């Protein structure tokens, strides 16, 4: 009389400890392969008074190629995988499966654009821990890559029509979410640290910073952006500044596949039947979630 049944499981991409583990890990990889020559961080005490802390250590420049990694289950636990089409990232998943390790990942620290990640199978998908709350970040997962090549000549090249179609489809998916009669507009960052304002990323150890204004100025040939390689930056691992050594080889290049975006929607509390979206990012944890949203580690019971 016993009935056979599939095991339904509940996922929450916004509360996945795999994210914190990866975050801790990428930090460990960097602390052992991309150490700063000088590091300045805030050193405080109870009362609330702080003095700057400075650390000087060896900072050897090294050639850096992408090493594919993945997370596997320790004896005793299993990794669940949601296979649902257009899975939201939270709620129960009907067609789930198990894997020993997650798919191979080529992690990239960046902002505004997600580089070299996994693409969506069907159409574009957008996910947020809460679309109504405008303080929460919107992760856009593309289903079609948009290549972007950069040169040491401070400029990255991006296909304009390719990229304009992308904003078109991204915009279309936002409507399905915020309303089919609402007006979708893309505006540049509202400001903050240079890491937040520009599209910044690390390619082979070098820290690039590109003006992204041309990418987020849109209403519903190539696109060359002004880029810069910096030696002095603000850290993504902790609050503080770091200084790295200059580049080794004269010409520094970089080829990356744009696979997603980090957006925010302006809290347009005012009645207007229009929504504004700007480049987001900053917490590298959202970069980790965009790849781990379909997994959930659990105990074998």
């Amino acid at each position: 009389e016993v009935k056979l049944e599939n095991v339904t499981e509940n996922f929450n991409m916004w509360k996945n400890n795999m994210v914190e583990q990866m975050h801790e890990d990428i930090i460990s990889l960097w602390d052992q392969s991309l150490k700063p020559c000088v590091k300045l961080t805030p050193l405080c005490v109870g009362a609330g008074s702080c003095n700057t802390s400075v650390i000087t250590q060896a900072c050897p420049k090294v050639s850096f190629e992408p090493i594919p990694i993945h997370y596997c289950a320790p004896a005793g636990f299993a990794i669940l995988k949601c296979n649902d089409k257009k899975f939201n990232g939270t709620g129960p998943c009907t067609n789930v499966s198990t894997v020993q390790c997650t798919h191979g990942i080529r992690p990239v620290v960046s902002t505004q654009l997600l580089l070299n990640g996994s693409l969506a199978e069907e159409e574009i998908v957008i996910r947020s821990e809460n679309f109504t709350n405008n303080a929460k970040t919107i992760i856009v997962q593309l289903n079609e890559s948009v290549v972007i090549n950069c040169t040491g000549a401070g400029h990255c090249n991006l296909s304009k029509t390719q990229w304009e179609n992308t904003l078109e489809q991204i915009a279309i998916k936002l409507k399905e979410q915020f309303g089919n009669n609402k007006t979708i507009i893309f505006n540049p960052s509202s400001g903050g640290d240079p890491e937040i304002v520009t599209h910044s990323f690390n390619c082979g150890g070098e820290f690039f910073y590109c003006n992204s204004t041309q990418l987020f100025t849109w209403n519903d040939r190539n696109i060359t952006l002004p880029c810069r390689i910096k030696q002095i930056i603000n850290m993504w691992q902790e609050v503080g500044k770091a200084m790295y050594a200059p580049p080794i080889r004269g010409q520094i290049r970089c080829s990356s596949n744009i696979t997603g975006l980090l957006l925010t929607r302006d809290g347009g509390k005012d009645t207007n039947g229009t929504e504004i979206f700007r480049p987001g990012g900053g917490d590298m944890r959202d970069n980790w979630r965009s790849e781990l949203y379909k997994y959930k580690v659990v105990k074998i019971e």
């Epitope: 000087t56 910096k230 030696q231």
Partner: antibody
Framework: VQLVESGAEVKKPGSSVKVSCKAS????????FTWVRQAPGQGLEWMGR????????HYAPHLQGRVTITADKSTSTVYLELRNLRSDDTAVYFC?????????????????????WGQGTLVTVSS | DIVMTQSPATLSVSPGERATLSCRAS??????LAWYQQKPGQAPRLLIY???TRATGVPARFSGSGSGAEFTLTISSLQSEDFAVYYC???????????FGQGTRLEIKR
Amino acid sequence: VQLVESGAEVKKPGSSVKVSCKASGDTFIRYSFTWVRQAPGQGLEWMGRIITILDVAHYAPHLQGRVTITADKSTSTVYLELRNLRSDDTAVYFCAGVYEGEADEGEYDNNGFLKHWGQGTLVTVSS
Amino acid sequence: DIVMTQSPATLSVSPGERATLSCRASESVSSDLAWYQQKPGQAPRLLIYGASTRATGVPARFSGSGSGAEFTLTISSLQSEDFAVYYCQQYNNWPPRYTFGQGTRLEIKR
């Protein structure tokens, strides 16, 4: 790009001296500055260097926290402080600096050589 | 502690002739090697840096050469203004603990 230092000094043992180096001619924060000493009849001695834009100074070990290198972005002036002076601290102190690039835009060469030099300041320590 | 050794301590050479100064590092320093000239009662002057790159305003008779832990400074035609003391300096280590050579005094042969 000019570097000018304050006049000679005669100090009493155990006292402190603070030499200054007024830089001018270009963007102060785009240079790093070094202090070099040379005792009478002796060679050059590297004392330390400050990464101005970052406001961080590094020093030569055997100085045991008696020296402090500081900069004042407001007046484009670098300073060398030496404490609890001893007779053998008597020497000419040289101030120097080099262009590092667009530090203010985040670029930095971290060049360790010395292109521009002050005139030197004589410091005599004796009772 | 990276030690820089210069040889010989004193070099005598006739004017108009060629001089060649030696500098050795106790260990590798790559190319972060500079050369300075200093006349008595004056501040040092930068001549070469990056082992072979010659600073601006420095005669072409002055040429730098070397790599690793062995460097050389060459002056093809000694002029009166070239007779002084020369120092080499390394700035390759980090944390920075830069150091100078003891010096090589260039004097006139008569």
